[PDB]
Amino acid sequence: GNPLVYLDVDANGKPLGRVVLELKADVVPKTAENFRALCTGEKGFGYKGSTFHRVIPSFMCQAGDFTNHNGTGGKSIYGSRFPDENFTLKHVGPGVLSMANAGPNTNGSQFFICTIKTDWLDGQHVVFGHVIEGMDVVKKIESFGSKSGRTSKKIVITDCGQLS
Ligand SMILES: O[C@@H]1CO[C@@H]2C[C@H]1Nc1ccccc12
């Protein structure tokens, strides 16, 4: 069974609500497991307390750099980077959960949730899940972004974890 995990997100300390994500461990077990474990914090580090640092309306919301908080950092539960597992899942529309990277085989912890079909990323970013509920919360996050990616409020993952 695929994990169900959640992100509780605030904007300047004000709750926006909860995003619930299905992780496709049945297709990309290593990538799903990394994200699941970073939600629970069970390795001693993870997403709790970190930010959505790059948010671009009509594109995507990017988070997961819990070390440098600016797109340069993050790390996986395996090491500083891990290979692209596969590209079987595609960026088919809004709600897709996919790995940010810095080129081939540079997955760490940064990730993005799409607010549009980002099919030009197929074959280059590992898709590993989708939004089950809370896409309205993703839209609220999106509303505090801008074309440069700079956010107009501090968007924080106040809490995260696993539901099943
Ligand atoms: O080691 C890799 C590559 O450098 C950082 C940290 C980690 N993942 C990642 C993903 C997107 C952007 C930058 C990075």
Swiss-Prot record:
Annotated consequence of substituting residue 160 to S: Blocks Ca(2+)-induced mPTP opening and reduces hydrogen peroxide-induced cell death
The lineage's top-level taxon is: Eukaryota
Q: Which residues carry this modification: N6-succinyllysine?
A: 24, 43, 132, 147
* Positions of the PPIase cyclophilin-type domain: 6-162
Coarse class of the primary localization is: mitochondrion
Q: What class of enzyme is it?
A: isomerase
Keywords annotated in UniProt: Acetylation, Apoptosis, Isomerase, Mitochondrion, Necrosis, Rotamase, S-nitrosylation, Transit peptide
Q: NADP among the record's keywords?
A: no
Any signal peptide, and if so, which residues?
none
E.C. designation(s): 5.2.1.8
Point out residues bearing the modification N6-acetyllysine.
24, 124
- Report whether Acyltransferase shows up as a keyword of the record: no
Instruction: Describe regulators of its activity.
Output: Inhibited by cyclosporin A (CsA). Is displaced by CsA from the mPTP leading to a lower open probability of the mPTP.
- Kindly state one GO CC term assigned in the UniProt record: membrane
Residue numbers carrying S-nitrosocysteine: 160
Quaternary structure note = Associates with the mitochondrial membrane ATP synthase F(1)F(0) ATP synthase; the association is increased by inorganic phosphate (Pi) and decreased by cyclosporin A (CsA). Interacts with ATP5F1B; ATP5PD and ATP5PO. Interacts with SLC25A3; the interaction is impaired by CsA. Interacts with BCL2; the interaction is impaired by CsA. Interacts with TP53; the association implicates preferentially tetrameric TP53, is induced by oxidative stress and is impaired by CsA. Interacts with C1QBP. Interacts with MCUR1.
Q: Which family does it belong to?
A: Belongs to the cyclophilin-type PPIase family.
The protein's name is: Peptidyl-prolyl cis-trans isomerase F, mitochondrial
Instruction: Tell me the stretch of the parent sequence this chain holds.
Output: 44 to 207 of 207
